[PDB]
């Protein structure tokens, strides 16, 4: 993917635009907060929050807090 990330794509159901760096061998998606202007090459997910702790360098989302 190469979608442009901003507080518009995922911000509806209290969501954040998460750039999940899901690669070869990733049970937990390393979803870094999409910076306005950045592009998501991997799995861009619209997740709520999950927990903004224990995962600052790429939020460790349990993949169960997003619409799609």
From Swiss-Prot:
According to the UniProt record, one GO cellular component term is: fungal-type cell wall
The UniProt-reported impact of residue 56 to G is: Does not significantly affect self-assembly and rodlet formation
GO MF terms on file? structural constituent of cell wall
Disulfide connectivity?
Answer: 10-46, 19-40, 20-31, 47-66
- What effect on the protein does mutating residue 60 to G have, as reported in its record? Impairs self-assembly and rodlet formation
Q: Which UniProt keywords apply?
A: Cell wall biogenesis/degradation, Conidiation, Disulfide bond, Secreted, Signal, Sporulation
Q: What induces it?
A: Expression is controlled by blue light and by a circadian clock. A positive activating clock element (ACE) is found to reside in a 45-bp region, just upstream from the TATA box. Expression is regulated both developmentally and by light and is abundant in illuminated mycelia and conidiophores but is not detectable or is barely detectable in dark-grown mycelia, mature macroconidia, microconidia, and ascospores.
Give the location in the cell: Secreted; Spore wall
Q: What is the effect of changing residue 35 to G?
A: Increases self-assembly and rodlet formation
Among the record's GO biological process terms, what is one?
cell wall organization
- Presence of the UniProt keyword Signal in the record: yes
* Stated consequence of mutating residue 61 to G: Impairs self-assembly and rodlet formation
Q: Say what the protein does.
A: Aerial growth, conidiation, and dispersal of filamentous fungi in the environment rely upon a capability of their secreting small amphipathic proteins called hydrophobins (HPBs) with low sequence identity. Class I can self-assemble into an outermost layer of rodlet bundles on aerial cell surfaces, conferring cellular hydrophobicity that supports fungal growth, development and dispersal; whereas class II form highly ordered films at water-air interfaces through intermolecular interactions but contribute nothing to the rodlet structure.
Its domain description in UniProt is:
the Cys3-Cys4 loop (residies Cys-20 to Cys-31) does not have an integral role in the formation or structure of the rodlets and that the major determinant of the unique properties of these proteins is the amphipathic core structure.
Report the sequence similarity comment from the record. Answer: Belongs to the fungal hydrophobin family.
Assembly: Self-assembles to form functional amyloid fibrils called rodlets. Self-assembly into fibrillar rodlets occurs spontaneously at hydrophobic:hydrophilic interfaces and the rodlets further associate laterally to form amphipathic monolayers.
Protein name as it appears in the record = Class I hydrophobin eas
Gene (UniProt): eas
